[PDB]
Amino acid sequence: MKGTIVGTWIKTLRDLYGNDVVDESLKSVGWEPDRVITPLEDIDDDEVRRIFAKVSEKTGKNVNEIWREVGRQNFKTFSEWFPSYFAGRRLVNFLMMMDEVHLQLTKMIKGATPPRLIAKPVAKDAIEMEYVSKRKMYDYFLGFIEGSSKFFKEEISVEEVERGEKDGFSRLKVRIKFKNPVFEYKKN
Ligand code: HEM
Question: Is 101 in the pocket of ligand 1 (CB under 6 A)?
Answer without folding.
Answer: yes
